[PDB]
C-alpha cells in the first residue's frame, strides 16, 4: 500500500568504510555503494544517479542531518525530489547479514556489497512469492499504467 | 521486438576521463558512470551492480577485447551473464550531445553525466510516447508476467 515514489536512504559502517544504502520502501528493492567518505557530496551524487533511474519523489532517512548540506539540497532541487517526514524494515541488518555470508568470497568490501545486493534483490519472497527486483518493476510499471 | 535481458556496454572518452555507458537495447534506457580507469576491474564491478538491479542475461559491446579479462569473466560467471555476439543506436553521440548541453551547469564531468542520464531516461519519445525509463520498467514487468 506504500507510495511507489518513496525511498529510504542511510549510511552503515563496516570495516572502517561507508556503505550508502537506498531502499525502495514499497518493494524492499535495494541499491548500495561503498563510498569513500560519509559526505554531502557523496549523498548528492548518489541521489542524482538514483533519480535518473527510478521515479524518485520523496526520500526519508533515519539521520535527518544527512540532508542538510547545500550540496544535497541542490541535488533534490534539480531532480525534483522532496524530503519525506511522515513514514508509518530493517535491511541494514539483513543486508549486513548477507554481506557477512558472502564476505570471504570477494577480496574487497565493495565487491561483497554488490554481491549481497544482487542476492537480496533476486530472492523469491514466499515464506505467489516474487523477489524485490520483480516487485519494484511491477509496482512502478503498474503506477505508469 | 528485442529480448529484454540484452544490454550493450561501452566506454567513451571526454575531458581525458572515461565514461562507462550501459544501454538496455529493447528500451533505450541508459546507466552510466565516470570511471577512473578504463580497466577490467572497473567493468567487472559495473557489471555486478547492473546485474543486481536488472535481469541481465547477455551483454554486447563494440570493443570485444573489453570482455577478455579474467576479472570481467569472473563477474559474468558469478552473475550468470553470457556474452551476446549476434546483434541485428547510437547513444554515445546522443548522450554526448546532452552532456554538452548541460556541461556548464555542473562543476564536474561525473555530475554532468548523471544529469544527462536523467534527462535521457525521462524524455517522452513521441516524434503514445513513453520515456526510456518507463519502457524499461514495462518491458521487464511484462516479461515477468
Ligand atoms: C579484486 C578482484 N580481483 C579479481 C582477480 C581475478 C578474478 C576475479 C577478481 C575479482 C572478482 C571479480 C568478480 C567477482 C568476484 C571477484 C566475486 C564474485 C562476484 O564476481 C575481484 C573483485 O573486485 C572487482 C570486482 C572490483 C574486480 C573482488 O573484490 O574480489
Ligand atoms: C561539486 C559540487 N559542488 C556544489 C556546491 C554547492 C552546491 C551544489 C554543488 C554541486 C551540485 C550538486 C547537485 C547538483 C548540481 C551541482 C548540478 C545540477 C544537479 O544537481 C556540485 C556537483 O558535484 C556533486 C554532485 C558531486 C556534489 C558538481 O559537479 O557541480
Numbering used by the authors:
A (entry chain A), B (entry chain A): 55 to 142, 152 to 190, 192 to 209
Show sentences the authors wrote.
To understand the structural basis for the reduced binding affinity of BI-D to H171T IN, we solved the crystal structure of BI-D in complex with H171T CCD dimer and compared it to the complex of inhibitor bound to WT CCD dimer. As expected with the high concentration of BI-D (~5 mM) used in the crystallographic experiments, the inhibitor bound to H171T CCD dimers. Furthermore, the H171T substitution did not detectably affect the inhibitor position within the binding pocket (compare Figure 5A and B). BI-D hydrophobic interactions with IN CCD subunit 2 as well as hydrogen bonding between the inhibitor carboxylic acid, and backbone amides of subunit 1 were fully preserved in both crystal structures. Importantly, though, we observed differential interactions of His171 and Thr171 side chains with the inhibitor. The imidazole group of His171 formed both an electrostatic interaction with the carboxylic acid and a hydrogen bond with the tert-butoxy oxygen of BI-D. However, the side chain of Thr171 which establishes a novel hydrogen bond with the carboxylic acid was unable to form a hydrogen bond with the tert-butoxy moiety of BI-D (compare Figure 5A and B). BI-D binding to H171T IN CCD resulted in a significantly higher Kd of 10.3 μM. We compared the results for both BI-D binding to the H171T IN CCD and its WT counterpart (data not shown), which suggests that the less favorable electrostatic interactions between BI-D and Thr171 primarily contribute to the lower Kd value for the inhibitor binding to the mutant protein. Crystallographic experiments and binding free energy calculations have indicated that Nδ-protonated or doubly protonated forms of the imidazole ring of His171 can engage in both electrostatic interactions with BI-D carboxylic acid as well as hydrogen bonding with the tert-butoxy ether oxygen of the inhibitor. These interactions are compromised by the H171T substitution, with the Thr171 side chain forming a less electrostatically favorable hydrogen bond with the BI-D carboxylic acid and lacking any additional interactions with the tert-butoxy ether oxygen.
